[PDB]
Enzyme design. Structure first.
Site, PDB file in Angstrom:
ATOM      1  CG  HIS A  53       3.818   3.972  -7.723  1.00  0.00           C
ATOM      2  ND1 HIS A  53       3.267   4.075  -6.466  1.00  0.00           N
ATOM      3  CD2 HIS A  53       3.082   4.777  -8.532  1.00  0.00           C
ATOM      4  CE1 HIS A  53       2.213   4.868  -6.521  1.00  0.00           C
ATOM      5  NE2 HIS A  53       2.086   5.307  -7.764  1.00  0.00           N
ATOM      6  CG  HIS A  92       0.941  -3.535  -6.462  1.00  0.00           C
ATOM      7  ND1 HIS A  92      -0.301  -3.194  -5.979  1.00  0.00           N
ATOM      8  CD2 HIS A  92       1.809  -2.643  -5.922  1.00  0.00           C
ATOM      9  CE1 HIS A  92      -0.188  -2.159  -5.165  1.00  0.00           C
ATOM     10  NE2 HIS A  92       1.084  -1.795  -5.143  1.00  0.00           N
ATOM     11  CE  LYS A 121      -0.752  -0.980  -0.325  1.00  0.00           C
ATOM     12  NZ  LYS A 121      -1.706  -0.793  -1.445  1.00  0.00           N
TER      13      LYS A 121
END
EC number: 3.1.27.-
Length: 122
Positions: A115, A14, A41
């Site tokens: 996350h 990310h 993904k």
């Protein structure tokens, strides 16, 4: 501070500091580079800019508590969302890029992002 495997993985999945172009080909290349193509993904967003601003989402400096133990940033970030197209789960993974500029939602552990909540980019 102790190493945090999930923080390191958060960066891999990310974070891209200084991206080239942010077009479809950008997504197709970076998703391969970051090991996100076996299987492809379905959606994945990268945050751009410096890391210290992302880490600061975990503190009052740049974040607020959000929902069930998430955090939402005070600042807005340049981001690029890569969305899989085509119907097959397997490579080659074709992606459509959507560049954005907004705040982000993460979860944190020991002051580190672990996350990214993808729901806000769907």
């Amino acid at each position: 501070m102790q190493d945090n495997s999930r923080y390191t993985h958060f960066l891999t999945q990310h974070y891209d500091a200084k991206p080239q172009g942010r077009d479809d080909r950008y997504c197709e290349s970076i998703m391969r580079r970051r090991g996100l193509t076996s299987p492809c993904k379905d959606i994945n967003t990268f945050i751009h800019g410096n890391k210290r601003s992302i880490k600061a989402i975990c503190e009052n400096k740049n974040g607020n508590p959000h929902r069930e133990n998430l955090r939402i940033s005070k600042s807005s970030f340049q981001v690029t969302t890569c969305k899989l197209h085509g119907g097959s789960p397997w490579p080659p993974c074709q992606y459509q890029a959507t560049a954005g500029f907004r705040n982000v939602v993460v979860a944190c552990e020991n002051g580190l992002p672990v996350h990214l909540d993808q729901s806000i980019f769907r």
